[PDB]
Structures are given as structure tokens and as C-alpha cells.
């Protein structure tokens, strides 16, 4: 194909992943503990929180190898099977996370906007069922690359993993990624939080300060998801709109490593955003975490 390189590609993703590991590992562990406490209190939300934490923790444990993958100018010296498993986890966990945020959002809409109703949908058993369904659907829909070539070895000092420059099947995989793993779940998240705010408007028992607080929190959730995941999918839709565009007439070296890899690294910040946004800002979850740290 056409060779590409970037100098900053070497630097920024590794340090960003070091911060992601060193911060999001203990924070996601603590969020998992708080989620388990919520599950023990017959709460339908903790089980989703449990999956989210889990979906991030696996991702975190995948990251070290990509660190070695990056600081070596894209040189994989750890094998094909490791490439398959670790690339699958790395590229699929972010969509699993987006799906679980959507599930949390819908649960909140059903609880706040429509109380006194849909009690069957707000059980722990139904939450386990939908968690199994989302894990199956996400792991099976994104298992397309597992049945194709693992890596590529272009001899410009590169050795690749779950990506080939240029890039058939990966194009439509990218289109599905962008449209039905980002825009659809994000549309549901936005619509449900708009519903929550409209329901909160008419709350007599809620004073004005708390409505503003809820609005700031909901907007922060939507905005942080968008800012973390939008650059990667924008570049991915642009690159997949040119591989199904002018075919085999593509010079995208000025925008391959820099754009793509900086943006994947920047997508990894969602794994540290979720523990802070869904556990550490709430008072009760912090009380539970303080109880956990009192023991140790």
C-alpha cells in the first residue's frame, strides 16, 4: 500500500495510556465495588454499573501491549493469537461501554419520567437478561474481524495489528461502527436525558438548585461521551468514505497515524471518565468507597 508515519504517534498515545492505566485502574475497581453494593440493595442500576466497570477493566488490562505496540513505531512482536484476542477486546470494549451507558440512560428515563409504571422492567433479573443480551450482541456483531486476516507486515519498520493501511469488509464494518455503535446509542442517551429533564421540570418537591444540578450532570454526561468518541468516529467515517470513495487512489499519510492513533488514544479517556461520572460524583457512592477505604 502507501506508507505512513508520525513522530508524535510515538509519544502521545503511550503517555496517555500510562495515565489511563495508573488512574482508571483503581478508580474502575472502586466503581466496581460501589456497583456491587448497589446490586446488594436490590437496585436495578448497579448491575449495569457492574458491566460498565467490567467493560472498562478488561480494556485497561488490554492496554499495556498496545503501549509496547506504539513506542516501537507500530511493531508487534507478541504473536498472531495475542493480536486477535487483544485487538478484539481493545476495539470492541468501547462499543460495549457505549451500549451500557445507553442502558443506564434508558433505565433512568423509565424510573424518573414514568414512575408508578413499568415495574417489571426495573428488576434485577430483567437487568441481568438485558446485560446478557447486550454482551452477546456486541461481542457477536463486532466479531467480524476475528474471521479475517489478523495482522499485516509492511516492511517499512511497521508490524501491524487489527489495522491495515490502506484498508472490502473493514469499510462496511467501519460504517456499522459509526452509525450503530455511536450515533444510535448516543441518540438514545440524549433523548432519554431530555425526557428526564422535562419530567424534572414539573417536580414540586425539587427546589431550583437541584434541577440545575441535574441539568449540569446530564449535559456533562452527553458532552463527555461526545468529546471522547467523536474524533475517532469522524476520522473513521472520513477514511471509510474514501476507501469506498476513490478506490486505490488514496494518499492519507498526512492523516493516518496522527489522526487515527491520537484519536484512539483520546477515546481511551472514556474508561477514566465513567468511574468519575457515575460513581465518584454521587454522595452515597463516595460514602460506600470511604467505607471500603476505612477497612484498608
From Swiss-Prot:
A multitude of proton-sensing residues, which include extracellular histidine residues (His-148, His-158 and His-261) or triad of buried acidic residues (Asp-56, Glu-138 and Asp-274), contribute to activation of the G-protein coupled receptor activity and pH sensitivity. One of its GO terms (cellular component) is plasma membrane. Residues 150-165 are annotated as: Extracellular loop 2 (ECL2). The record marks 138 as: Required for activation. Residues 39-42, 115-122, 203-206 are cytoplasmic. One of its GO terms (biological process) is response to acidic pH. This is G-prodeshotein coupled receptor 4. It comes from the Eukaryota. The keyword S-adenosyl-L-methionine does not apply. The keyword Transmembrane applies. Disulfide bonds join 2-250, 83-161. The chain holds residues 8 to 304 of 362 of the full protein. Keywords: Cell membrane, Disulfide bond, G-protein coupled receptor, Glycoprotein, Membrane, Receptor, Transducer, Transmembrane, Transmembrane helix. Changing residue 261 to Y: Displays smaller cAMP, rho, PLC responses to mildly alkaline to acidic pH of 7.1 but almost the same or higher responses to severely acidic pH values of 6.5-6.2. Changing residue 210 to A: Induces a shift of the optimal pH for activation. The chain crosses the membrane at residues 2-38, 43-73, 79-114, 123-149, 166-202, 207-242, 253-281.
